[PDB]
RNA sequence: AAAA
């Protein structure tokens, strides 16, 4: 399949990481793709701490077809991947 | 199931990471959840070096139902996730 | 099998990481081998952000025999692993 | 089983990480255990770059009983885990 | 290596 990790701030700013196959989808892989987007500096994303993220992840785990995984950044956080 | 990683200092301070399913429970995933709690700064937790941690982990690996995994922080260490 | 991660800048500079078996080949393992090459400092590689990398990875996933995985570094990036 | 990662410098200095079960043994897990020993600071170990490490790892992967995995540190490197 |  394909799963596109999307960094999104309430701006409406998008950053679409290259897609990953559903076979590979996990929490580790999602933060793996984001780290690749941000580079050598470790990133900060407050929303990772919240339970939504884990629910939104289990949600896509149980879906059909190609999906898009949204990860919520502040307007300040999303400038790490710009 | 659910497994809640709990950061706990001898204060009695709790920090409950969002739960993870038993299917996903591992050492890598536990430090993964904690890192998400601490953010972009790598954390220090002395108790990770001790064999208790590994035993306490194998313990929960072999349990039934939803469990809670306690990770012991100094009173100073737990301020990383506060 | 064997899969040799090769860091390559348009110079034509090679850096060959020790090989990994196809059974172990993944995105996580590739960045794992590179990190081992670079050491304690987190590395920067711009090409990781691009979709080529993910395609070039799925490509080798679906191959026979021993392959070589090329990872494109700027001429400045490849000095991290030298 | 058990597999004890041992940091060893030519001094003869030992540092024994808590054991891991053979079911869990990998390159990722070995550097995972070492990181836990070193803490919040990323560690440097030159020997990780060499092919010996990968051979010495495949070696233990194909063994019976409980083994000990030796990781070679300079006399200066081993002070990271002391 | 906890995102390598
Ligand atoms: Na990792």
Author numbering:
A (entry chain A), B (entry chain A), C (entry chain A), D (entry chain A): 69 to 150
Q: From the publication, what sentences describe this entry?
A:
Type III CRISPR systems detect invading RNA and activate the catalytic Cas10 subunit, which generates a range of nucleotide second messengers to signal infection. The Csx23 protein localises in the membrane using an N-terminal transmembrane α-helical domain and has a cytoplasmic C-terminal domain that binds cyclic tetra-adenylate (cA4), activating its defence function. Csx23 is activated by cA4 to prevent successful phage infection, most likely by disruption of the host membrane integrity.
To investigate cA4 binding by Csx23 at an atomic level, we co-crystallised the soluble CTD of Csx23 with cA4. Diffraction data were collected on the crystals to a resolution of 1.76 Å, and the structure was solved using molecular replacement with the monomeric AF2 model as the search model. The asymmetric unit contains one protomer of Csx23 CTD, comprising two beta-strands, linked via two alpha-helices to a third beta-strand, which together form a mixed anti-parallel/parallel beta-sheet, followed by a short alpha-helix at the C-terminus. Interestingly, the 4-fold crystallographic symmetry creates a tetrameric arrangement of Csx23 CTD, which is consistent with the behaviour of the protein in the presence of cA4 observed by cross-linking. R95 of Csx23 CTD makes electrostatic interactions between both terminal nitrogen atoms and two different oxygen atoms in the phosphate group of cA4. This loop must display flexibility to allow cA4 access to the binding cavity, and then changes conformation to close over cA4 once bound.
